[PDB]
Design a protein around this motif. Structure first.
Motif, PDB file in Angstrom:
ATOM      1  N   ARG A   1       0.855  -1.175   0.000  1.00  0.00           N
ATOM      2  CA  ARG A   1       0.000   0.000   0.000  1.00  0.00           C
ATOM      3  C   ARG A   1       0.904   1.241   0.000  1.00  0.00           C
ATOM      4  O   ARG A   1       0.743   2.113  -0.849  1.00  0.00           O
ATOM      5  CB  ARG A   1      -0.899  -0.040   1.225  1.00  0.00           C
ATOM      6  CG  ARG A   1      -1.917   1.057   1.330  1.00  0.00           C
ATOM      7  CD  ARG A   1      -2.625   0.942   2.681  1.00  0.00           C
ATOM      8  NE  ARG A   1      -1.795   1.356   3.822  1.00  0.00           N
ATOM      9  CZ  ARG A   1      -1.681   0.692   4.971  1.00  0.00           C
ATOM     10  NH1 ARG A   1      -2.352  -0.437   5.168  1.00  0.00           N
ATOM     11  NH2 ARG A   1      -0.867   1.146   5.911  1.00  0.00           N
ATOM     12  N   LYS A   2       1.883   1.286   0.912  1.00  0.00           N
ATOM     13  CA  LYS A   2       2.860   2.393   1.012  1.00  0.00           C
ATOM     14  C   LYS A   2       3.627   2.582  -0.297  1.00  0.00           C
ATOM     15  O   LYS A   2       3.781   3.702  -0.788  1.00  0.00           O
ATOM     16  CB  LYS A   2       3.883   2.123   2.118  1.00  0.00           C
ATOM     17  CG  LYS A   2       3.303   2.169   3.517  1.00  0.00           C
ATOM     18  CD  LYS A   2       4.337   1.800   4.567  1.00  0.00           C
ATOM     19  CE  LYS A   2       3.692   1.562   5.924  1.00  0.00           C
ATOM     20  NZ  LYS A   2       3.341   2.810   6.612  1.00  0.00           N
ATOM     21  N   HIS A   3       4.153   1.489  -0.828  1.00  0.00           N
ATOM     22  CA  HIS A   3       4.865   1.529  -2.088  1.00  0.00           C
ATOM     23  C   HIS A   3       4.004   2.149  -3.197  1.00  0.00           C
ATOM     24  O   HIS A   3       4.465   3.031  -3.926  1.00  0.00           O
ATOM     25  CB  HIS A   3       5.273   0.114  -2.496  1.00  0.00           C
ATOM     26  CG  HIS A   3       5.890   0.032  -3.852  1.00  0.00           C
ATOM     27  ND1 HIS A   3       7.241  -0.173  -4.046  1.00  0.00           N
ATOM     28  CD2 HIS A   3       5.345   0.140  -5.085  1.00  0.00           C
ATOM     29  CE1 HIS A   3       7.500  -0.198  -5.342  1.00  0.00           C
ATOM     30  NE2 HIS A   3       6.368  -0.009  -5.999  1.00  0.00           N
ATOM     31  N   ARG A   4       2.756   1.694  -3.321  1.00  0.00           N
ATOM     32  CA  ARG A   4       1.859   2.181  -4.363  1.00  0.00           C
ATOM     33  C   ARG A   4       1.325   3.588  -4.175  1.00  0.00           C
ATOM     34  O   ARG A   4       0.990   4.259  -5.158  1.00  0.00           O
ATOM     35  CB  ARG A   4       0.736   1.171  -4.617  1.00  0.00           C
ATOM     36  CG  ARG A   4       1.269  -0.126  -5.242  1.00  0.00           C
ATOM     37  CD  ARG A   4       0.185  -1.134  -5.681  1.00  0.00           C
ATOM     38  NE  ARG A   4       0.832  -2.209  -6.427  1.00  0.00           N
ATOM     39  CZ  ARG A   4       0.405  -3.464  -6.526  1.00  0.00           C
ATOM     40  NH1 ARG A   4      -0.715  -3.874  -5.931  1.00  0.00           N
ATOM     41  NH2 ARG A   4       1.163  -4.331  -7.180  1.00  0.00           N
TER      42      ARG A   4
ATOM     43  N   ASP B   1       2.312   5.639   8.595  1.00  0.00           N
ATOM     44  CA  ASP B   1       0.870   5.457   8.436  1.00  0.00           C
ATOM     45  C   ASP B   1       0.201   6.803   8.394  1.00  0.00           C
ATOM     46  O   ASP B   1      -0.690   7.033   7.595  1.00  0.00           O
ATOM     47  CB  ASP B   1       0.289   4.672   9.609  1.00  0.00           C
ATOM     48  CG  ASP B   1       0.472   3.180   9.463  1.00  0.00           C
ATOM     49  OD1 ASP B   1       1.625   2.702   9.375  1.00  0.00           O
ATOM     50  OD2 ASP B   1      -0.560   2.482   9.422  1.00  0.00           O
ATOM     51  N   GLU B   2       0.673   7.717   9.227  1.00  0.00           N
ATOM     52  CA  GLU B   2       0.118   9.064   9.303  1.00  0.00           C
ATOM     53  C   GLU B   2       0.234   9.753   7.943  1.00  0.00           C
ATOM     54  O   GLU B   2      -0.725  10.359   7.479  1.00  0.00           O
ATOM     55  CB  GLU B   2       0.825   9.867  10.413  1.00  0.00           C
ATOM     56  CG  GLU B   2       0.897   9.155  11.823  1.00  0.00           C
ATOM     57  CD  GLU B   2       2.110   8.200  12.011  1.00  0.00           C
ATOM     58  OE1 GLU B   2       3.251   8.691  12.174  1.00  0.00           O
ATOM     59  OE2 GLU B   2       1.925   6.960  12.007  1.00  0.00           O
ATOM     60  N   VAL B   3       1.386   9.618   7.278  1.00  0.00           N
ATOM     61  CA  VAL B   3       1.587  10.208   5.943  1.00  0.00           C
ATOM     62  C   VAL B   3       0.650   9.557   4.901  1.00  0.00           C
ATOM     63  O   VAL B   3       0.047  10.255   4.076  1.00  0.00           O
ATOM     64  CB  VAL B   3       3.075  10.121   5.499  1.00  0.00           C
ATOM     65  CG1 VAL B   3       3.218  10.351   4.022  1.00  0.00           C
ATOM     66  CG2 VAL B   3       3.859  11.178   6.198  1.00  0.00           C
ATOM     67  N   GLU B   4       0.488   8.235   4.961  1.00  0.00           N
ATOM     68  CA  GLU B   4      -0.408   7.540   4.032  1.00  0.00           C
ATOM     69  C   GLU B   4      -1.838   8.067   4.108  1.00  0.00           C
ATOM     70  O   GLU B   4      -2.496   8.212   3.084  1.00  0.00           O
ATOM     71  CB  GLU B   4      -0.465   6.060   4.337  1.00  0.00           C
ATOM     72  CG  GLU B   4       0.821   5.325   4.229  1.00  0.00           C
ATOM     73  CD  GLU B   4       0.559   3.850   4.216  1.00  0.00           C
ATOM     74  OE1 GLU B   4      -0.069   3.411   3.247  1.00  0.00           O
ATOM     75  OE2 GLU B   4       0.929   3.131   5.168  1.00  0.00           O
ATOM     76  N   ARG B   5      -2.331   8.282   5.329  1.00  0.00           N
ATOM     77  CA  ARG B   5      -3.683   8.799   5.541  1.00  0.00           C
ATOM     78  C   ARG B   5      -3.825  10.148   4.891  1.00  0.00           C
ATOM     79  O   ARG B   5      -4.833  10.419   4.262  1.00  0.00           O
ATOM     80  CB  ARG B   5      -4.004   8.942   7.017  1.00  0.00           C
ATOM     81  CG  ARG B   5      -4.079   7.635   7.754  1.00  0.00           C
ATOM     82  CD  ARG B   5      -4.353   7.836   9.241  1.00  0.00           C
ATOM     83  NE  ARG B   5      -4.229   6.559   9.929  1.00  0.00           N
ATOM     84  CZ  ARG B   5      -3.365   6.313  10.904  1.00  0.00           C
ATOM     85  NH1 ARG B   5      -2.545   7.270  11.333  1.00  0.00           N
ATOM     86  NH2 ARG B   5      -3.278   5.083  11.397  1.00  0.00           N
ATOM     87  N   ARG B   6      -2.821  11.000   5.046  1.00  0.00           N
ATOM     88  CA  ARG B   6      -2.842  12.315   4.419  1.00  0.00           C
ATOM     89  C   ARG B   6      -2.820  12.181   2.906  1.00  0.00           C
ATOM     90  O   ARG B   6      -3.498  12.911   2.189  1.00  0.00           O
ATOM     91  CB  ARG B   6      -1.630  13.122   4.858  1.00  0.00           C
ATOM     92  CG  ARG B   6      -1.710  13.587   6.296  1.00  0.00           C
ATOM     93  CD  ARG B   6      -2.952  14.441   6.481  1.00  0.00           C
ATOM     94  NE  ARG B   6      -3.000  15.529   5.506  1.00  0.00           N
ATOM     95  CZ  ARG B   6      -4.111  16.152   5.125  1.00  0.00           C
ATOM     96  NH1 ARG B   6      -5.279  15.799   5.642  1.00  0.00           N
ATOM     97  NH2 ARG B   6      -4.058  17.123   4.219  1.00  0.00           N
TER      98      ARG B   6
ATOM     99  N   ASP C   1      -8.513  -0.045   3.394  1.00  0.00           N
ATOM    100  CA  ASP C   1      -9.433  -0.265   4.492  1.00  0.00           C
ATOM    101  C   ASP C   1      -8.772  -0.034   5.828  1.00  0.00           C
ATOM    102  O   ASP C   1      -9.382   0.535   6.707  1.00  0.00           O
ATOM    103  CB  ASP C   1      -9.945  -1.699   4.434  1.00  0.00           C
ATOM    104  CG  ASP C   1      -8.824  -2.711   4.135  1.00  0.00           C
ATOM    105  OD1 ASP C   1      -8.517  -2.925   2.934  1.00  0.00           O
ATOM    106  OD2 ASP C   1      -8.243  -3.280   5.095  1.00  0.00           O
ATOM    107  N   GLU C   2      -7.525  -0.465   5.976  1.00  0.00           N
ATOM    108  CA  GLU C   2      -6.798  -0.291   7.231  1.00  0.00           C
ATOM    109  C   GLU C   2      -6.514   1.188   7.486  1.00  0.00           C
ATOM    110  O   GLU C   2      -6.071   1.573   8.578  1.00  0.00           O
ATOM    111  CB  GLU C   2      -5.481  -1.056   7.202  1.00  0.00           C
ATOM    112  CG  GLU C   2      -5.634  -2.543   6.969  1.00  0.00           C
ATOM    113  CD  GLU C   2      -5.059  -3.380   8.102  1.00  0.00           C
ATOM    114  OE1 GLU C   2      -3.810  -3.511   8.185  1.00  0.00           O
ATOM    115  OE2 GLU C   2      -5.862  -3.910   8.908  1.00  0.00           O
TER     116      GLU C   2
END
Lengths: 212, 212
Positions: A74-77, A107-112, A133-134
């Motif tokens: 997810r992070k990579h993509r 995770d905080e950066v991904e949400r943003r 979803d996570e």
């Protein structure tokens, strides 16, 4: 941060994804690591309970191993999306840049990102971005989410059903705190709402779910 | 990528920046590494010619050490700008996120950032972003910049003055290639312009400067 286990798990995920049987030689090849190095890395990933070498010598990811693999992909993509849509990095460099960023993105950066990017369903290379979803696209239990500095989050679940302690139900009712209620949290665990302050008991501090 | 030397060099740069004498104890403290660990890391950074322990036991960065430190800080600070302005990450988390990103961000990404961000003069914490100059804000010699796939870059310098070989001067003149000329490059080193193709000789392939 930038680690081997994450890289191996992502590789297994990919092969699996492309319908290839995750065999050690296939992994060694792709990661460009010798067969002996992969054997030993797999040997310790097996001890961490992340992977198990099936009878046919194929690598079966355990539920824990798979969850980790999913976060890495997810992070990579999401990194790829950021690099192409926002940053504008040359499409020929995007994948190799995202392969390094996946280990340092929080995770905080991904949400943003999920909030600032137009589309997070697929990476620019055609594959779907897993585990959204996570990322709230259930929840973090307040005891883990609650920091020393207040932060208005949203109550997702109360789990009154799991409470042996019911003394604070009316306290929350008077406090007007329920599923969907934007609340302030401080870590005993104090969660404020509508100006009324509620100091949660341990049992409630552990089962109430929120989302940032 | 995510390395110690980069982290130490940045720390020295910071102390220097805040007007603090870069002493080993100060560094060990900030990096939260024992004094023996810093002593040994400094001991090998000294062998790589990146730092020298001055007589007063303070760390003097060599020109090479300083250049590296500058790239790390520029990356770190451009990461901060990206995280606050674009991504919107909480100001309380920005610094620690940028501290990990600084080791994986490529020069190519920095150039794009410098182009997509409104302001790159300072980081959100008040300090100036160093080394923008190295980002075209002279140039890469074509032999190093030229890739197997054509890429229109701009000629910055020809350095005819350093040419013992003058056979290709008129070739470039007919080719209409000069300082500021957008050209196509492929790596002998062939650089096309206005439809005319020029296969550079080694001496020219080494001294002509361009910027991406």
């Amino acid at each position: 941060l930038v680690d081997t286990t994450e890289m191996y798990l992502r590789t297994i995920y990919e092969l699996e994804e492309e319908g290839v049987t995750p065999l050690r030689a296939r992994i060694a090849e792709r990661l460009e690591q010798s067969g002996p190095t992969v054997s030993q890395t797999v040997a310790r990933m097996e001890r961490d309970g992340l992977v198990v070498v099936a009878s046919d010598r194929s690598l079966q990811m355990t539920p824990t191993g798979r969850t980790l693999a999913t976060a890495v992909m997810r992070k990579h993509r999401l990194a790829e999306r950021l690099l192409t849509d926002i940053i504008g990095l040359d499409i020929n460099k995007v994948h190799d840049e995202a392969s390094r960023w996946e280990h340092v993105m929080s995770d905080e950066v991904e949400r943003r990102l999920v909030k600032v990017l137009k589309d997070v369903s697929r990476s620019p290379f055609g594959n779907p971005i897993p585990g959204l979803d996570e990322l709230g696209v259930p929840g973090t239990r307040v005891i883990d989410a609650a920091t020393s500095m207040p932060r208005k989050v949203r109550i997702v679940q109360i789990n009154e059903i799991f409470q042996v302690e019911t003394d604070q139900f009316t306290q929350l009712l008077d406090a007007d705190i329920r599923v969907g209620s934007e609340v302030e949290i401080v870590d005993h665990i104090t969660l404020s709402h509508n100006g009324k302050d509620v100091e949660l008991l341990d049992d409630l501090a552990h089962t109430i779910r929120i989302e940032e």
